[PDB]
Write a protein that binds this ligand. Structure first.
Ligand SMILES: [Zn+2]
Ligand SMILES: [Zn+2]
Ligand SMILES: [Zn+2]
Ligand SMILES: [Zn+2]
Lengths: 375, 375
């Protein structure tokens, strides 16, 4: 079985492409796939590099999407082997980006090579949408490329985002969508004063308390067959001057919803304002929504991914929308069906990040099985 | 009517005796009262100066207590006239310490002079207990002097603390005691994690929420004829890393009780622990109690103060235990009866601090009336 995915994953990992830097990872990919008919189109915005590689000119268009940037390593001596010197050890490949998400990219590229070699007259088109900023604020990465593609009507039928999705074994989980994310920055207003004269002050911690309990106990929805219940979480709360004999004048609270399609952005905001208003809270509230939920319901793409996983890995993949998010939240606008599929995400963003070596050629063969079933 | 109190209040105020500095205010007082039979005893501890002046050697011993230190002025150009250049204007005397509490000290000293002159063979003893640190952490001020006096069995029958006690008119309020103060530093423990996986974290804001509501709604006691209900107030709350996609690992809350004699220190602590435990909160809690409540019930001293106020000011003084505290919390240990009595506290610790000029010789004549009724 092929070793080409492994060695390409190594050369990618060896590049310290901390966001938003690419270190010519995109150039490497472009030059390699150019050899088998992929045209390259660079789309740079701000400090972020993006590439849209494409072979073929007609439908169906199957897209692989991913990112070449990695999160910072932390103090390097805490690693067992250096984070940008990929090492084989105990049946694993260790390095920053080994799981998120350079190995996926390497597996897909080799899958393209093997597919195109076995089927040089295949129908449709194969594309790669690669960015150097998914891990940061992501203002100039995939979202810009999607807008360019949508503006010139270059649409996608099937997209696979190579993010790591597995719980333990490769293939046990595919993502067919993600929660939206809605964030609030609440400033509860009181009136500062000496703690010994509470009747001349208004303690914003005390005024907020009944709403906070109602917020943290609230059932937002029950989820459905594809999504878990909408989740509300407080991330920060800060109030006071540091003196233990003063009642603060204001209290700042930061909170977030990861919400399913059972609830809407507008609905959540109205509910939050209603809870605060019914308890007489005086406040300012700034909202920000960094994404809507998206979903690809059971269909050809999910069926095909399951079948390829059953063939290669021997297991039944489960569909999931849990966890964080991905660039799928931008791409779904131009992709009719989109899934995410990759290796274990157990060690992402952590020190001694790794992937099982046996999963590497399996992942690539899954991607190749997907290509064959769609094209 | 005499102008001696005014001019002595001026020379005191003109000294910038920001805690714990005295600027020889205590030396001035000692040298002045030495002329009429007061022996001086310096009791210095750390950076704090204390003086125990006394005329007479037998009971009853009447004590005036007070402090020569003042709080910082703030940026001086914000004042209408300089804070340490005492100015007469619009029937008021302006300056740092004009209300808290140099004018009281000046009024009592002149009262001693007039009393002793009119009654050179009076019974009992007159004492002044003066410190240069009441406004700060007060570890080396009156509390040390009291321990020295108590150790050599030098006890006090009647004490008047010159803190400003008036609401509007001089004499409308006397303090016959104060609340205790019990402070808690609570650390609620959770488990930090990414906000999108709440089932792998424990949000300490959410775990604390039901206890916080129960704490801020709790009726601690109903007070009694002398005290208002025990008061619980949150001063600080802080939790989070600053990232809006992280659930904090811990939450810090600082709170305080100003409590009456209806509740005990131990009882309050047990109640707080019981509320937190019944909601399953996991926490560390450090307590500190900076004073017990103290009370002088209606008696000769309150009766005498009321009667002197009725004579000089023409109004009926009300007894109160509200507000902050004073060095009475130390002195009550050796004083059988103690009250506080001074001018308006409306402008204490603020810029353009002042006292009505007409209240100055009235305050002094009240103190003199107290001396005459007790000695
Ligand atoms: Zn990723
Ligand atoms: Zn990532
Ligand atoms: Zn004072
Ligand atoms: Zn003060």
């Amino acid at each position: 079985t092929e070793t080409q995915s492994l060695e390409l994953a190594k050369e990618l990992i060896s590049r310290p492409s901390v966001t938003p830097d690419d270190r010519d990872c995109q150039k490497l990919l472009a030059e390699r796939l150019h050899k088998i008919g992929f045209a390259a189109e660079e789309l740079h915005f701000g400090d972020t590099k993006n590439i849209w590689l494409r072979r073929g000119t007609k439908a169906p268009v199957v897209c692989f999407a991913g990112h070449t940037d990695v999160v910072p390593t932390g103090p390097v001596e805490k690693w067992d082997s250096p984070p940008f010197e990929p090492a084989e050890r105990d049946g694993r490949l260790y390095g920053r980006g080994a799981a998120d998400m350079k190995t996926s990219i390497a597996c897909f590229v080799t899958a393209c090579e093997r597919f195109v070699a076995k089927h040089p007259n295949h129908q449709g088109s194969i594309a790669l949408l690669i960015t150097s900023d998914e891990e940061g604020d992501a203002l100039d990465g995939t979202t810009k490329v999607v807008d360019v593609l949508k503006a010139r009507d270059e649409l996608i039928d099937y997209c696979i985002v190579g993010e790591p999705t597995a719980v333990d074994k490769l293939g046990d989980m595919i993502k067919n969508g993600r929660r939206g994310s809605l964030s609030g920055n609440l400033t509860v207003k009181g009136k500062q004063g000496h703690i010994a004269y509470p009747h001349l002050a208004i303690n914003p911690v005390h005024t907020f308390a009944p709403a906070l309990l109602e917020l943290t106990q609230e059932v937002w929805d029950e989820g459905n067959e594809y999504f878990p219940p909408t989740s509300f979480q407080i991330s920060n709360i800060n109030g006071g001057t540091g003196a233990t004999n003063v009642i603060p004048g204001e209290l700042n609270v930061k909170f977030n919803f990861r919400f399913s399609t059972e609830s809407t952005e507008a609905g959540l905001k109205q509910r939050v304002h209603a809870i605060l208003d019914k308890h007489g809270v005086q406040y300012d509230l700034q909202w920000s929504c960094s994404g809507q939920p998206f979903l690809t319901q059971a269909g050809k793409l999910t069926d095909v991914a399951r079948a390829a996983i059953a063939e290669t890995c021997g297991i039944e993949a489960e569909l999931s929308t849990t966890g964080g998010t991905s660039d799928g939240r931008f791409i779904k606008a131009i992709a009719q069906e989109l899934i995410e599929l990759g290796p274990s995400n157990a060690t992402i963003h952590q020190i001694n990040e790794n992937v099982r070596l046996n999963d590497i050629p399996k992942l690539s063969a899954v991607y190749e099985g997907i290509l064959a079933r769609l094209l």
